[PDB]
Amino acid sequence: AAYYQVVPVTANVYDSDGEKLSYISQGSVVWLDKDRKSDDKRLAITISGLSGYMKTEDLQALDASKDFIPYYESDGHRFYHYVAQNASIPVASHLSDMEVGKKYYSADGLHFDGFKLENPFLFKDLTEATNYSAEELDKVFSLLNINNSLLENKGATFKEAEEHYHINALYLLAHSALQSNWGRSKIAKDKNNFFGITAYDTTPYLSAKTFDDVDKGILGATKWIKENYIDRGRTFLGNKASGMNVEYASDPYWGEKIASVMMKINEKLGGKD
Numbered sequence: 219a220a221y222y223q224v225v226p227v228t229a230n231v232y233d234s235d236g237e238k239l240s241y242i243s244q245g246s247v248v249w250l251d252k253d254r255k256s257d258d259k260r261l262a263i264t265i266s267g268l269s270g271y272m273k274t275e276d277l278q279a280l281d282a283s284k285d286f287i288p289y290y291e292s293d294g295h296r297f298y299h300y301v302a303q304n305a306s307i308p309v310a311s312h313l314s315d316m317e318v319g320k321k322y323y324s325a326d327g328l329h330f331d332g333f334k335l336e337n338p339f340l341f342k343d344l345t346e347a348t349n350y351s352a353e354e355l356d357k358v359f360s361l362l363n364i365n366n367s368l369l370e371n372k373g374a375t376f377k378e379a380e381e382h383y384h385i386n387a388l389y390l391l392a393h394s395a396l397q398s399n400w401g402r403s404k405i406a407k408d409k410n411n412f413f414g415i416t417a418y419d420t421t422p423y424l425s426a427k428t429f430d431d432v433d434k435g436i437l438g439a440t441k442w443i444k445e446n447y448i449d450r451g452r453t454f455l456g457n458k459a460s461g462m463n464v465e466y467a468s469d470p471y472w473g474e475k476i477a478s479v480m481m482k483i484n485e486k487l488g489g490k491d
């Protein structure tokens with residue numbers, strides 16, 4: 219087949235030496251890479267920018283005439299990634315080279331056969347501060363109709379985290395927005411954990427770290443991200459080939475999803491970043 223889906227809760231992606239490069243989630247769809255050798259035991263695949271090998275034991279062949287394969291499509295205003303059959307995210311503005319309502323396929327969401335996208339927030343250095351003030355960040359809750367969020371009116375805490383730890387506050391707001399549903403997930407509400415800190419795929423709720431209150435959750439997650447990712451050379455969101463997404467989450471499109479939120483917030487707040 220041309221496309222395969224991940225069967226177990228997570229599966230590893232390996233290099234040609236058998237070393238682990240990353241891991242991806244159940245249901246993820248990988249592309250067969252016809253430029254490298256596959257065998258009965260391992261398939262040469264590509265996912266979210268990463269070219270490696272996966273065990274056939276971890277995969278099920280798809281038929282693209284009847285099974286969902288992730289794709290990109292323009293509505294004539296924004297270009298969307300269908301990351302699941304019933305879920306799309308905006309990743310870029312419409313380009314004149316895009317046909318409205320036509321499905322496009324890409325292993326990285328950057329290179330398409332007739333156009334190339336810039337996803338600047340995906341690769342932005344997260345140690346550079348945002349140009350948004352605390353009050354500006356707080357305005358986006360009303361502008362995006364975000365109701366009953368634990369993160370409402372926390373712009374000052376995000377900017378304090380940025381000041382102390384040197385991590386972009388727009389990224390911190392976007393990461394917490396995406397991963398905890400704007401601080402409305404059960405992990406957010408029960409554990410003040412807005413960033414999926416130690417929320418491992420096997421037992422995400424039980425494994426998730428607990429923080430003392432909302433502010434200590436923002437600051438404590440920022441400390442954890444600084445110490446475990448930024449200080450270890452993972453300084454941008456990225457994908458399965460480079461950046462925080464290699465290790466932070468099994469979801470191949472975690473980085474793209476956070477970059478999409480950054481893009482949405484940035485547009486609502488007047489394009490200062």
Ligand SMILES: [Ca+2]
Nearest residue numbers: 233234235237
């Ligand atoms: Ca190696």
